[PDB]
Design a protein around this ligand. Structure first.
Ligand SMILES: O=C(O)/C=C/C(=O)O
Ligand SMILES: O=C(O)/C=C/C(=O)O
Ligand SMILES: O=C(O)/C=C/C(=O)O
Ligand SMILES: O=C(O)/C=C/C(=O)O
Lengths: 463, 464, 460, 461
């Protein structure tokens, strides 16, 4: 069942029930690319905030009647309350400006305003999509505004807290394991001792510098395009609109948005998405390493390293009965893989602006949100279902520590490099302990080796 | 909201009473809340349906599974292939790197659904055991990569290759249709020498021809199925010849020419075949990005750009600039190509990351591969129907830009030398005059020789 | 032609005239990968700084005799003054830790120290390559200290000043072209007016945001691993070594280096290299865009955009006589493409640390240093040879501005979107003017059109 | 300095150099990266194609035999490396590589003049544009240099280096076919396979990667030469395109042909994207294999240590006597480079405009570096690690008998849930599989000893 709606290109059959109009319907038919309604919901939600702020600012500045403001603001409250999700059917792989998603907000708000006000769907709306819902605005400033609201909100409300959660667990464990002495590995080969705390303190540190990197990118992402309209000059905006509309969005979201300092930079680039995604990708590579270590540390339990015990959450294996796997770690390394390709896509798209407009906005949008959501979700899962339950395998730690021929490094400042090297290669060649060959080569007394080669004394400076 | 108690080897689990999945699926659903729910691509669940039926038929032919049990497994698999059990697969991509949780989802749903088919009550342990019967002779470690290769191969020969062929042939037809339209070439974006619009479009059609061969070259590796490798590649716990027998049944049920992998260790420890065929997809993506980007430069304007071609005007371009029309079909294609490039970074990185007997990045690789295959398919169809089939020359515009170009003076090279031909062009440039005036004014060429040697239509081929 | 040197593995035939020893020679023969001596000179230089620092630190802490500090320092002063460049033949593609280059420094300092003291090359050195030159150090903490010193020095002495010089030319051009009204383009299609000034003001702002993104990463990049030794613990360092040695690096380099907060993160990762390189790659994607716009605006001169004129530095074409190309633009887009792939390499390698050490140190070092370098060089080349010489093509600009149908956008707040659309659509189909069709459709008086459709008035 | 002149005016050129005005402008105007970074491999390919051009130009009646011989001699001098200091131009030049095309054109013509008994500082008897560049553009020559140089390096260095490693890994799959070890999945103890079988996997990887590379050669052997300015072959004699490709096959000993479509051949580097894709597939495979061999080799006493590898140098300046899998690191580092090289190449591949892709030098440099590094580290790794790999036999047997997942052998006897009871109880009690199978009475001692045999677990029932 259809009704005819009209745009400046003529007549379009629109599903009779649906609040969208001609432009939303053409796009839904002209971009049959991947799954329906793939435009992020976070982008639509952002549009809810800024269309409502546009309306509010336009009335304060004398270009929209209060009557129309309130109908727009109520239809935006419905979008925000998730009452109209079945009214946003457009894909990511549309016009690169996101014009069709902007007109989807505009047509849905106008037709929904009309029915709120007592009219029939398919009657000329009391609210015009272009002249009223879109007054003072372009797809070219509204879509980048939706991008930064969705991006800033997800990064500060989901991603930073989730990464902070895992950072504090990792720092907690580092503290909890400060007196567990273990064997280091460089190049995967037996090395000198460090505490399990020291190992985890490295991991805690990785996310601390990553959190700082992400925070450093927020001043740029807080800047909103809204007011630059078609090309950044703010043609067709009342004076004060850029500052005023950013105060509404700031009031409505609770987040410290400001108007962009250079609206030509804010339309022709998404350098801010590149900037913040770069830092997300810094954290994804640190996360990869941490997850990879932890499965290596848990490997076995009998014929691997097996120096830690991780929580056992599920049957690991359909054929190998009673096998248990570090499945939280695999989740986290696969998210990290995804984030790095997301960064290729964003970097590539960011370089591809032409003149006044970057037209890679949706794909930049979709990839940034997916990275920020997946980092958030996997740090919560990995913290809950792995990191918090990590315990030492004490006897395994103690065996692999004691077997290291490279405890011989404690001897370096006492007998010199070459004499230390003779002891280790003699023990290796002969199949004996350091302590035997140190004594039998006449290079160290039994009491000096017992005093010097003490792993608990090899996890700090001399004294 | 109602519950029953299922058990696995780790303990009891509350499972939604109405659902056909069991304890392990319910564990995964609650333990891997990462991204949207049910993100594991339907093409993989579709592929598992094919391979699980084949497994049961193979196991029955080699006398290790009773026929009655093969029948019940086949009917539940058939209901998965007919899309009647889509609500019974809620597990995400970002699960165990092996896909063990999705393999158990299939096993559990086939077991319980089979139980109910036969007259049993959901909640009861099934006449068909999830591990000992549905999973007989199999591992997550050979089934998941078998599902990846079935889904990958099917999507490439049924969607992707057909779509790219469709667009290639349109660009070939437009090459033939525009063979006599002479236009100006551009190199480094500056005015150059003549070629036909048809020659320009022949570039585009040839790029997709070399694309189609590059992808087809990758199918030999992709048709190969890990099924029978089991846990580590050795085929532990398989009947003699199960590996070949199950590949025959997967080939028989899909209609596609699948074969058992030459080396099950390569088939479990790597997804080199997925890296291989994605690489070809990314080559096609890079070509398509270029063709699309050419078409928007060629149509740009309509007045203050190049504007040498007219494209179909599909929709209002702009909410604030009234009557603007944009190259939206070109923008969708360039945006997909950018996606396919990240996909390739992701797949190549995961592909390097296998350990000993198993690569545990299988879902991320599968998910990225299928998105690439599917988007390339859809955007090529969208672009063929809504842009390429409708492209026509702006003939007045083309002639103006062709007749303007100072580098028609290149045609003088063989007659008067580079150095004299350059004087003509620097003079005609300084003076705002034509090449012919300054070639005659400077006395470097007669009227008769200029007219003889400087024919745009002759400059589209070898010396005549 | 060869003399005998030994390591803990046995005897090696070393070229008799060279200052290196058994380990360098082994490395030279066993890693025949890429062009000879690929380890970047900046890593060697950084090493020159930190080996001197270590020696000076070791003496103030009473574990190295002053006579041996003096010898080691003189050898290091010779490295720093590029006297010893033919004593370093090892490749990037060696051990993942850079152990072999560490020992290259150790052996050449030790041997050079011997000869400075009055001995002869081939005699046992008065200075030990492990016990003295490498006292209190690992390859594990030295080679990251080398990377950070080289990477910091390059970014603050080369990359940032190059990028700052281009930013300022771009900003001068924004003020220079402040009243030059041109047509906007969105989707490559004719749009509404902005000044050439404003357009360049977007460029200047891009590089202002990039400079901020790079500097934000400098606090992490100035942290030095030196003192972590083998695994991060500072095994076999005197107390306060980590902090005394960073101060000497800082004093000798004149750069704000500090001992790392966490030595296990300093050894097990190169997250500082990933952070900073991410910022270099942001700037790189900004420069691509800017360079691609300038070529698009200069395109033609008769069959393109033609809105700017760029310096003409050279014949552009061996067959098309008199043709001239925007060749600086091309160099800058090619660098940008390099830096994106350098970023894939650094990110990927950055993820592949095991336990207490990332053993990708040189591949991360060489990609990093190339990006900092190529971005500094191309920013200087593009500034000198293109950006400072850009001029408007004013006749062409004006032609292209007054042709634009989307000047009609100016009618929106007066006659609405649908009426403005009917004027632009009608003008486009009939090949007539906006003004003509405004009047033919009865929608705007000729007076109102000429008051309302003013390009100079559409620019904010 | 001497004065040389181009169509733009006078240039002071180093008085002794065979290069001229345009080479000298490039040298001064693109001070980007280290000096003379244009790969020598491109210069060599230029020497082959400039000579083949002269040769074809003479047969087709449009260049005098005298001028052919002077260009051929200069070209043979470039080919044999007598003129490497006559090529001072960087990668980071004009994206067409015109300036390097004009470097070849200026050096051939000045060097031809001195052979013919002229002096540097006279116009050459041989015009760099009209004679050495006759029937040519940078637009077709540079992509011809690229393909010749790419194809040559791949078939003469990369493929043989990869096939040599492939051969060793195959020979090790035989050497070790009867050495039973424990497999790991998820880094966790699994079921047996032979160390032969595991190396069979590594051999299979490089076979597939080499096939993938060889599949891309039919594209890469196609030469742009004859397209000239925009792909039309403006100013080429009829047949020039086929005849010059014949001359190039003959000089090189490789089967080059003229490209089927000169527009594809100028406006794209799709053949580089194609072939480098397959280099990249091989590098990710090599990454996995190098990574496996350091994990298997790890220890000696506190890691896996299931293989011994050749000990080629002291591992560590502070950890005395330590020995590292240094060959594995070089290979994994090379692999990291090839991945990022593939990003650069793919980016540049997308960025052609109208009739010409002007990303040519950066595509070329990145391709040739991947092909050279894959070749160098594959020979180094085969010679200094792969050939000398041996099983650590006592260690293999300890780690094999330790795995609780030998219990898998009991699936088809007692079924999934009973097998898991034994492994879980064993894991819980810190006891042995045998102990607990027997202890719970799910298997007799006699049946267990017959049923749980690692050597019987590396094949089908
Ligand atoms: O939709 C807009 O507001 C703008 C579109 C464009 O610049 O084409
Ligand atoms: O689910 C499986 O069959 C295998 C899992 C594993 O190797 O751990
Ligand atoms: O060269 C070093 O000091 C350390 C090397 C290693 O960990 O093996
Ligand atoms: O150098 C050439 O032959 C071509 C250059 C160009 O097309 O501009």
């Amino acid at each position: 069942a259809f009704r005819i709606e009209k745009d400046t290109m003529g007549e379009v059959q629109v599903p009779a029930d649906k609040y969208w109009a001609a432009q939303t319907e053409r796009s839904r038919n002209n971009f049959k690319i991947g799954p329906a309604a793939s435009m992020p919901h976070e982008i639509i939600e952002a549009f809810g905030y800024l269309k409502k702020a546009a309306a509010f600012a336009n009335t304060d500045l004398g270009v929209l009647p209060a009557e129309k403001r309130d109908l727009i603001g109520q239809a935006c409250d419905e979008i925000l309350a998730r009452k109209l999700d079945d009214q946003f059917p457009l894909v990511i792989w549309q016009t690169g400006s996101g014009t069709q998603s902007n007109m989807n907000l505009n047509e849905v708000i106008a037709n929904r305003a009309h029915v709120i006000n007592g009219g029939k769907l398919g009657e000329k709306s009391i609210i015009h999509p272009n002249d009223d819902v879109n007054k003072s605005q372009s797809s070219n400033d509204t879509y980048p505004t939706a991008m930064h609201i969705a991006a800033y909100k997800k990064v500060v409300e989901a991603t930073i807290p989730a990464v902070e959660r895992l950072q504090k667990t990792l720092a907690a464990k580092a503290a909890e394991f400060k007196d567990v002495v273990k064997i280091g590995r460089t190049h995967l080969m037996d090395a000198t001792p460090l505490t399990l705390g020291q190992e985890f303190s490295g991991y805690a540190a990785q996310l601390s510098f990553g959190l700082t990197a992400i925070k450093n990118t927020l001043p740029h992402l807080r800047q909103l395009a809204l007011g630059g309209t078609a090309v950044g000059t703010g043609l067709n905006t009342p004076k004060g609109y850029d500052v005023k509309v950013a105060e509404y969005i700031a009031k409505f979201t609770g987040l410290p948005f400001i108007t962009a300092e250079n609206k030509f930079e804010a339309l022709a680039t998404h350098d801010a998405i590149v900037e913040t995604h770069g830092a997300l990708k810094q954290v994804a590579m640190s996360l990869f390493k941490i997850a990879n270590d932890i499965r290596l540390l848990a490997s076995g339990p009998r014929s691997g390293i097996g120096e830690i015990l991780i929580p056992e959450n599920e049957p690991g294996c359909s054929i190998m009965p009673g096998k248990v796997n570090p499945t939280q770690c695999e989740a986290m390394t696969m998210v990290a893989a995804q984030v790095l390709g997301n960064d290729t896509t964003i970097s590539f798209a960011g370089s591809q602006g032409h003149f006044e407009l970057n037209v890679f906005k949706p794909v930049m949008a979709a990839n940034f949100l997916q990275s920020a959501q997946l980092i958030a979700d996997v740090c919560i899962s990995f913290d809950e279902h792995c990191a918090t339950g990590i315990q030492p395998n004490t006897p395994r730690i103690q065996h692999l520590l004691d077997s290291s021929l490279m405890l011989v490094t404690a001897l370096n400042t006492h007998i010199g490099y070459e004499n230390a090297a003779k002891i280790a290669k003699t023990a290796h060649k002969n199949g004996t302990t350091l302590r035997e060959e140190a004594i039998n080569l006449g290079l160290v007394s039994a009491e000096d080796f017992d005093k010097w080669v003490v792993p608990a004394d090899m996890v700090g400076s001399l004294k």
